[PDB]
């Protein structure tokens, strides 16, 4: 009926890690190649995603137990979940009023259409928006949102993972924290945890669908040239 | 005492090719990652150079005889001279009054200092400025400036070149055009041609010095990540 001293320490860390790596002002967006509204949004969005990947890496490094993993496993986990963590973290900018990520003014307000001018069809963009709406409607506590990102990241079932025993242990340790936080600190959340886990399944599907659209982009040199080195490397299929 | 019908056709082509690939308004610069004034200028300058490389490729393709070369040779020539063509073409924005490339306002006015915030020392930047001043002082006709770029590009002595017989022929054909244009159309230019050839030698030295500073950048992943795919590929040492 009460969160342990160890469970609250890992929460403090995760919540701080997210504050260190997520800017609510989105002031760094001016440093990206400007948005343009064929495939005009690709450069801006490629920079946005590249920037976010660096942020996700910074966050990951502060996840309790992550640094204790092999460089290989760390990479296998980041490469496989990077896009999912990005999709999760963006919910914080997503707005239900307009069904779009609002990062400031007309420039950094991203609607579903903008992403279609970056090489993605509604065949994939539909589920993503639906996902954001369902995720926003959950009205997650910051503690839960953050815990969800870290649990996503430490998923055992990822291509390339070697020590899927330690990873699952770290993830289980995290799930316990989450299930306990909700039970204790979040009224009416008796059903919440289960809904959050279902969202992880959704992310797998969104991930699969993104990697397919991205594969076409990465295979067209005229488009791939618009990406960044980090994006190409992280979303690339090179094997370590 | 008069330029031939064939010599003037290749001039028309080269001068048009340059007009198609060089914007005096520099209006595309707003689409690059903004300039910042460690290594803050690297992103803007990397985008500038990447953009310029695409332009140089477009120009090259229109050089009489270039398209008739092997894809390999075309690549060997572009990879080896890209930086030299960029250094040549930038003279058109360089200004003696302020000793800097002036592409519009404080933002796109590049001084020697700006480039030092992009990974280059004055140990290399000095000769480059001196080169620009000497080049500007030559007050080249557009026909000569353009001819010089095309002769630089079609230089036989480049690493990777295979058919150095046809290349030299194309270059000789070009040098003749230049020596004849100056003799006929450019008063007091009896010494000009020779001075232009010496500039090509200068470019080799500038090229050598750039590739050394660039090698350090490309070897530091935190810096290399700020480059573009095109830059990395064109200035990279992969062998075809």
């Amino acid at each position: 009926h009460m969160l342990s001293d160890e469970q609250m320490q890992i929460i403090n860390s995760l919540v701080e890690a997210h504050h260190k790596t997520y800017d609510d002002s989105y002031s760094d967006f001016v440093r990206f190649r400007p948005p343009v509204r064929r495939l005009s949004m690709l450069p801006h969005l490629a920079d946005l995603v590249s920037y976010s990947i660096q942020k996700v890496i910074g966050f990951a490094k502060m996840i309790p137990g992550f640094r204790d993993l092999t460089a290989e496993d760390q990479i296998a986990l980041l490469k496989s979940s990077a896009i999912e963590i990005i999709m999760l973290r963006s919910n914080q900018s997503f707005s239900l009023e307009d069904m779009s990520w609002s990062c400031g003014g007309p420039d950094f307000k991203y609607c579903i259409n903008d992403v279609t001018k970056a090489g993605h069809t509604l065949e994939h963009l539909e589920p993503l928006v639906k996902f954001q709406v369902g995720l926003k409607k959950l009205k997650l506590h910051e503690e839960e949102h953050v815990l969800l990102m870290a649990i996503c990241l430490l998923s055992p079932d990822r291509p390339g993972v070697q020590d899927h025993v330690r990873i699952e242990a770290l993830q289980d340790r995290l799930c316990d924290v989450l299930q306990a936080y909700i039970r204790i600190q979040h009224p009416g959340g008796r059903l919440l945890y289960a809904k959050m886990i279902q969202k992880l399944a959704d992310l797998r599907s969104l991930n699969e669908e993104h990697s397919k659209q991205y594969r076409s982009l990465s295979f067209q040199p005229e488009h791939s040239m618009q990406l960044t080195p980090l994006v190409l490397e992280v979303f690339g299929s090179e094997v370590s | 005492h008069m330029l031939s019908d064939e010599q003037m056709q290749i001039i028309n082509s080269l001068v048009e090719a340059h007009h198609k690939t060089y914007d005096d308004s520099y209006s595309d610069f707003v689409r690059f990652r903004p300039p910042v004034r460690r290594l803050s200028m690297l992103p803007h300058l990397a985008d500038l150079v990447s953009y310029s490389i695409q332009k140089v490729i477009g120009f090259a393709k229109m050089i009489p005889g270039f398209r008739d070369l092997t894809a390999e040779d075309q690549i060997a020539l572009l990879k080896s001279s890209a930086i030299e063509i960029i250094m040549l073409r930038s003279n058109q924005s360089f200004s003696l009054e302020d000793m800097s490339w002036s592409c519009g306002g404080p933002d796109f006015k590049y001084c020697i200092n700006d480039v030092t915030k992009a990974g280059h020392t004055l140990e290399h930047l000095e000769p480059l400025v001196k080169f620009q001043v000497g080049l500007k002082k030559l007050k080249l006709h557009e026909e000569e400036h353009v001819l010089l770029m095309a002769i630089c590009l079609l230089s036989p002595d480049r690493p990777g070149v295979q058919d150095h017989v046809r290349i030299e022929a194309l270059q000789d054909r070009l040098c003749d055009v230049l020596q004849a244009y100056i003799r006929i159309q450019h008063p007091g230019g009896r010494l000009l041609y020779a001075k232009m050839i010496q500039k090509l030698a200068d470019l080799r030295s500038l090229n050598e010095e750039h590739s050394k500073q660039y090698r350090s950048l490309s070897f530091q992943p935190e810096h290399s990540m700020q480059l573009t795919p095109l830059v990395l590929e064109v200035f990279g040492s992969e062998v075809s």
Binding site: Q54, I57, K61, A71, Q74, I75, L78, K79, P229, L230, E233, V234, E238, S240 | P221, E222, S224, M225
Partner: peptide
């Protein structure tokens, strides 16, 4: 070889 990733992972 993931040169950038290794790097960013301190």
């Amino acid at each position: 070889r993931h040169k950038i990733l290794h790097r960013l992972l301190q």
